[PDB]
Enzyme design. Structure first.
Site, PDB file in Angstrom:
ATOM      1  N   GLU A 357      13.141  56.991  53.877  1.00 17.81           N
ATOM      2  CA  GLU A 357      12.812  56.146  54.980  1.00 17.81           C
ATOM      3  C   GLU A 357      11.705  56.837  55.941  1.00 17.81           C
ATOM      4  O   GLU A 357      10.806  56.168  56.264  1.00 17.81           O
ATOM      5  CB  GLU A 357      13.895  55.439  55.602  1.00 17.81           C
ATOM      6  CG  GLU A 357      14.580  54.486  54.562  1.00 17.81           C
ATOM      7  CD  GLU A 357      13.930  53.325  53.930  1.00 17.81           C
ATOM      8  OE1 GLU A 357      13.808  52.413  54.354  1.00 17.81           O
ATOM      9  OE2 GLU A 357      13.512  53.617  52.758  1.00 17.81           O
ATOM     10  N   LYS A 463      17.701  53.847  15.390  1.00 21.92           N
ATOM     11  CA  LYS A 463      18.920  54.870  16.046  1.00 21.92           C
ATOM     12  C   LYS A 463      19.280  55.598  14.899  1.00 21.92           C
ATOM     13  O   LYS A 463      19.306  56.740  15.243  1.00 21.92           O
ATOM     14  CB  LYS A 463      20.059  53.588  16.387  1.00 21.92           C
ATOM     15  CG  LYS A 463      19.726  51.958  16.478  1.00 21.92           C
ATOM     16  CD  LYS A 463      20.738  51.447  16.477  1.00 21.92           C
ATOM     17  CE  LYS A 463      21.297  50.965  15.071  1.00 21.92           C
ATOM     18  NZ  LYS A 463      22.857  50.476  15.111  1.00 21.92           N
ATOM     19  N   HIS A 487      15.854  40.433  34.305  1.00 26.10           N
ATOM     20  CA  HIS A 487      15.144  40.436  35.398  1.00 26.10           C
ATOM     21  C   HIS A 487      13.899  39.820  35.045  1.00 26.10           C
ATOM     22  O   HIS A 487      12.669  39.873  35.501  1.00 26.10           O
ATOM     23  CB  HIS A 487      14.704  42.098  35.700  1.00 26.10           C
ATOM     24  CG  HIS A 487      15.543  42.516  36.987  1.00 26.10           C
ATOM     25  ND1 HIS A 487      15.157  41.802  38.136  1.00 26.10           N
ATOM     26  CD2 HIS A 487      16.497  43.398  37.184  1.00 26.10           C
ATOM     27  CE1 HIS A 487      16.164  42.591  39.107  1.00 26.10           C
ATOM     28  NE2 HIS A 487      16.740  43.300  38.331  1.00 26.10           N
TER      29      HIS A 487
END
Ligand SMILES: *[C@@H]1O[C@H](CO)[C@@H](O[C@@H]2O[C@H](CO)[C@@H](O)[C@H](O)[C@H]2NC(C)=O)[C@H](O)[C@H]1NC(C)=O
Ligand SMILES: *[C@@H]1O[C@H](CO[C@@H]2O[C@@H](C)[C@@H](O)[C@@H](O)[C@@H]2O)[C@@H](O)[C@H](O)[C@H]1NC(C)=O
Ligand SMILES: *[C@@H]1O[C@H](CO)[C@@H](O)[C@H](O)[C@H]1NC(C)=O
Ligand SMILES: *[C@@H]1O[C@H](CO)[C@@H](O)[C@H](O)[C@H]1NC(C)=O
EC number: 3.4.17.23
Lengths: 596, 185
Positions: A357, A463, A487
């Site tokens: 921040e 896979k 989302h």
């Protein structure tokens, strides 16, 4: 008698005008997520109504009469963004289905709940019932029933937006006055222009083998390294020499791979460090951490902060009925208004987040002189991706060396480095592989010539190829799990891999090279360095005046993307991992049930 | 022996358009930012003060550097410029908590377009719609035909760089006007 100055004023007056709307919307948003009242539950639709009117009217103004004879590509691109818009032209009766499949996801998710098998009415939401098991206890059936309950009473109410999509929606986007919309959802980087270089994007995706020949045979060694070191994880049900399990993958939607690694424990007693108790014991204090974490990056030739920020950032948790998201956000209030809110609690998460921040609130004024249309750095991906590497730099005893009580030669003793603090290699890239076919799903269903034998069959072959997942009760191609991504209605980016993913690739080809260490960031100096200030604080400001490739180049030295930051920094455990096992049996061994 | 400093402790500052010019005589005085050219403000007693040409304005915090002779800038081009015979200085101080109201103050203007060069200290009061198309606009908003002025929107929440300031400018013409310093014999 020229169109240039004729159309310029139209841009300039609104560029001066939009500031008040932006400011008002910012205070409205802050007031809402700080003071949640019925008067505040609805801020956006009413605060941005004037902004939407402005945007739409100026878009119809600029669109119908174009700017053919203009001779500055930078200005043309700058007005192009608000020149072109839409999504309000089509007929309601047919566009309503499209906006419904786009938006109604949020409503069902807000009214959704997942509960215990023996909790008919009185029960709680999805998260707390299942997210604590791996870190606290050992209970099988609760985690086992997860996908069944999902597929039976939580994932069944995603069908009303499902059945029409995969059946018809692939073709009915023909009236969208563009080539497509997948190019903008996962492809808004393909742009071609002028002034010396023409630039592309497909080189950031097609180099998978090229850039990870060194990481591709990593599952093929981990399949035995589990028995080598991670045995303490879970016996009595998991195949010792068989396949890796897939009915106990670990989570519901396959986000991260960090919930299965930390299970190797050879010792139990240690005088470790901790933010809970060891914070202030060794010549430390909790009040002046904000001042000293300032000093480390302000004594390099920068002045300090006024008391305005101090009184604007109160250091007390909400706690009471008044509550905010304790996760701190770098508020971009604008008009030289930079503010952060937090809770009074000391943690290493708190320290790293506070460091990020203050980095944000300190680098933000480098471009503060620019008018509205340039209010961001070179890339927003970095402004939220560098938090991890700054946390990594913080989590190192340079602080103890700088305060001067424990000398830097007091390196951790040999039997102390093996226990807890040497697992950081694949934590970032453990989620990469399964996203390629999701990224290309629209890119190869846009054509409409595709047959039905291949819907997303490629999953199982991938896979079998790299990972070795043997599929339990199927959430198969008929069940379009990518179409049911959570989302979708939150308009978060899925443009490169997930978010701020591939722009992190070539920038650090020379970061510590300039920071003057032959090798990795270890022992690479960041503190008290005269070169660091002129390496960052002057060049961390680009704007829209110059393309992003120039800002990239001024740091790296090359236009193309490479993978040199993937160097021998990761060697000290790669020398334990990738020399021996190239012979054992990995993945599928024809001794278990494949369909279950 | 005379009151001097009325403008330093002023009540309200007018718009950036209507300048305020006073004539006085036979007064002198002595001393956030201060900077002048002729002489130190504390030792200025050694020279003859002749003419008084006072003005004041309101300018956004950071662009105080644009108020100087022979500079460049939209605000200087449209409001005030100074000649090559520069003799004076610019004084300003921050009064955010004294001049900003929580609701917001939106009663200020500026200029964006012109048609020719401007001699210093000149005014145009006309606010007619601005035409640049071949077809004359008869009062139609938009299409390059609009209204020039635009508000500012100050609040006490605004940042330090953009916080409001009070601007003071004093010009003393070095003519043969009377002085303000003397003593016995
Ligand atoms: C930023 O950090 C401190 C904040 O005051 C300044 O260093 C101190 O300044 C005070 C007041 O001048 C002195 O009494 C201290 O002795 C200083 N401490 C030192 C030098 O370690 C520093 O100068 C400030 N930076 C700027 C550019 O003003
Ligand atoms: C960008 O790509 C150009 C491709 O050919 C061009 O395509 C269109 C735009 C027409 O203008 C056509 O005549 C051109 O040949 C390259 O020619 C161009 O060199 C590339 N840009 C740069 C800076 O090299
Ligand atoms: C929230 O609103 C109430 C009443 O409107 C007010 O008393 C309170 O101060 C507000 N919260 C904050 C943090 O100002
Ligand atoms: C009035 O002017 C004097 C002159 O120096 C100054 O000291 C003072 O702060 C001003 N304001 C008030 C309220 O006296």
């Amino acid at each position: 008698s020229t169109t240039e100055d004729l159309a310029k004023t139209f841009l300039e007056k609104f560029n001066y005008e939009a500031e008040e709307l932006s400011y008002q919307n910012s205070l409205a948003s802050w007031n809402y997520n700080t003071n949640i009242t019925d008067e505040n539950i609805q801020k956006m639709n009413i605060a941005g109504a004037k902004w939407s009117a402005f945007y739409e009217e100026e878009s119809q103004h600029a669109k119908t009469y174009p700017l053919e004879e203009i001779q500055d590509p930078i200005i043309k691109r700058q007005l192009r963004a608000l020149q072109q818009s839409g999504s309000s032209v089509l007929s309601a009766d047919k566009r309503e289905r499209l906006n419904t499949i786009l938006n109604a996801m949020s409503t069902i998710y807000s009214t959704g709940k997942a509960c215990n098998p023996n909790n008919p009415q009185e029960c709680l939401l999805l998260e707390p019932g299942l997210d604590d098991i791996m870190e606290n206890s050992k209970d099988y059936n609760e985690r086992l029933w997860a996908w069944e309950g999902w597929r039976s009473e939580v994932g069944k109410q995603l069908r009303p937006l499902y059945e029409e999509y995969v059946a018809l929606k692939n073709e009915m986007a023909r009236a969208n006055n563009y080539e497509d919309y997948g190019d903008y959802w996962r492809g808004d980087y393909e742009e071609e222009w002028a002034d010396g270089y023409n630039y592309s994007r497909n080189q950031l995706i097609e180099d998978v083998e090229h850039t990870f020949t060194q990481i591709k045979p990593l599952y093929e060694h981990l399949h035995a390294y589990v028995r080598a070191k991670l045995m303490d994880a879970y016996p009595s049900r998991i195949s010792p020499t068989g396949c890796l399990p897939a009915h106990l993958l670990g989570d519901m939607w396959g986000r991260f791979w960090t919930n299965l690694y930390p299970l190797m424990v050879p010792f139990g007693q240690k005088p470790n460090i901790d933010v809970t108790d060891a914070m202030v014991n060794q010549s430390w204090d909790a009040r002046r951490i904000f001042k000293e974490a300032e000093k480390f990056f302000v004594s390099v030739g920068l002045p300090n902060m006024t008391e305005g920020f101090w009184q604007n950032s109160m250091l007390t948790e909400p706690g009471d009925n008044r509550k905010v998201v304790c996760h701190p956000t770098a508020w971009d209030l604008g008009k030289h208004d930079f503010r952060i809110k937090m809770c009074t609690k000391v943690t290493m998460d708190d320290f790293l987040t506070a460091h990020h921040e203050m980095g944000h609130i300190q680098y933000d004024m480098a471009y503060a002189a620019q008018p509205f249309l340039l209010r961001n750095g070179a890339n927003e991906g970095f402004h939220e991706a560098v938090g991890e590497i700054m946390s990594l730099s913080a989590a190192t005893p340079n602080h103890l060396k700088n305060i001067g009580l424990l000398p830097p030669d007091f390196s951790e003793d040999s039997e102390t480095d093996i226990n807890f603090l040497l697992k950081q290699a694949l934590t970032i890239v453990g989620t990469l592989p399964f996203t390629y076919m999701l990224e290309k799903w629209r890119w190869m269903v846009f054509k409409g010539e595709i047959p039905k034998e291949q819907w997303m069959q490629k999953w199982w072959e991938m896979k079998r190829d790299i990972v070795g997942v043997v599929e339990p009760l199927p959430h198969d191609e008929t069940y379009c799990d990518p179409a049911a991504l959570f989302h979708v209605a939150n308009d978060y980016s899925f443009i490169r891999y997930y978010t701020r993913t591939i722009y992190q690739f070539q920038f650090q080809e020379a970061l510590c090279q300039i920071a003057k260490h032959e090798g990795p960031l270890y022992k690479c100096d960041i503190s008290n360095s005269r070169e660091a200030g002129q390496k960052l604080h002057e060049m961390l400001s680009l704007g829209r005046s110059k393309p992003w490739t120039f800002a990239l180049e001024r740091v790296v030295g090359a236009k193309t993307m490479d993978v040199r930051p993937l160097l021998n920094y990761f060697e000290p455990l790669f020398t334990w991992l990738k020399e021996q096992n190239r012979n054992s049996f990995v993945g599928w061994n024809t001794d278990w049930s494949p369909y279950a | 022996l005379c009151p001097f400093g009325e403008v330093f402790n002023a009540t309200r500052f007018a718009s950036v358009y209507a300048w305020n010019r006073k004539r006085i005589s036979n007064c002198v005085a002595d001393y956030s930012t201060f900077k002048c050219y002729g002489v130190s403000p504390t030792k200025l007693n050694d020279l003859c003060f002749t003419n008084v040409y006072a003005d004041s304005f309101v300018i956004r915090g950071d662009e105080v550097r644009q108020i100087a002779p022979g500079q460049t800038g939209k605000i200087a081009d449209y409001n005030y410029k100074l000649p090559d015979d520069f003799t004076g200085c610019v004084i300003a101080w921050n009064s955010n908590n004294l001049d900003s109201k929580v609701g917001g103050n939106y009663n200020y203007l500026f200029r964006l377009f012109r048609k020719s060069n401007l001699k210093p200290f000149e005014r145009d009061i006309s606010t007619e719609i601005y035409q640049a198309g071949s077809t004359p606009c008869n009062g139609v908003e938009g299409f390059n035909c609009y209204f020039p002025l635009q508000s500012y929107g100050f609040q006490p929440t605004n940042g330090v760089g953009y916080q409001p300031y009070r601007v003071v400018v004093l010009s003393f013409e070095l003519l043969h006007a009377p002085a303000t310093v003397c003593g016995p014999k």
